[PDB]
Amino acid sequence: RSPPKDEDDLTFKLDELILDDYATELERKHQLKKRSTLQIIKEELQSRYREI
Amino acid sequence: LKEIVRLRGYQCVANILTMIVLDQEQQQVDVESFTLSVLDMLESWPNSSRNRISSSQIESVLESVKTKLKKIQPIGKKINSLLNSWSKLEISYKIPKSQ
Structure with missing residues (x-):
């Protein structure tokens, strides 16, 4: 509702996330291999339905 | 109260404690009444994470003041x-x- 200077949305904060530790904890707790899924989610959140 | 947490009210309450019950410009009985009047809302506010406290480390101040006023056991037990x-x-x- 109040985007910062020269930014359309807060999707740029996703690049600070450490997806590797999140994938490791997901694999430990739930036995899910989701390392590529976090990257796909990040790319889709940064730009919804790009032209691939 | 959530807004005060966002404003880091615990940080201000740490200094408010320190000035009165670590620095001594007042009387011990009145400072004890103040401490009993200021522990209650700290006990009452909604809390979900020590990240809130970590922005103030008010627990350290609480340890210092329970150690200083160790003779006043209600304050110690409340802390x-x-x-x-x-x-x-x-x-x-x-x-x-x-x-």
Whole structure:
């Protein structure tokens, strides 16, 4: 509702996330291999339905 | 209260404690009444994570003041209950961020 200077949305904060530790904890707790899924989610959140 | 937490009210309450019950410009009985009047809302506010306290480290001030006024046992027991309640908190799993 109040985007910062020269930014359309807060999707740029996703690049600070450490997806590797999140994938490791997901694999430990739930036995899910989701390392590529976090990257796909990040790319889709940064730009919804790009032209691939 | 959530807004005060966002404003880091605990940080201000740490200095408010320190000036009165560490620096001594007043009387011990009145300072004891003040401490009993200021522990209550700290006990009452909604809390879900020690990240809130970590922005103030008010627990350290609480340890210092329970150690200084160790003779006043109600204050000590209330601070015991308060740190016991606060120590149960955590943040489940929180994704680390790049630094």
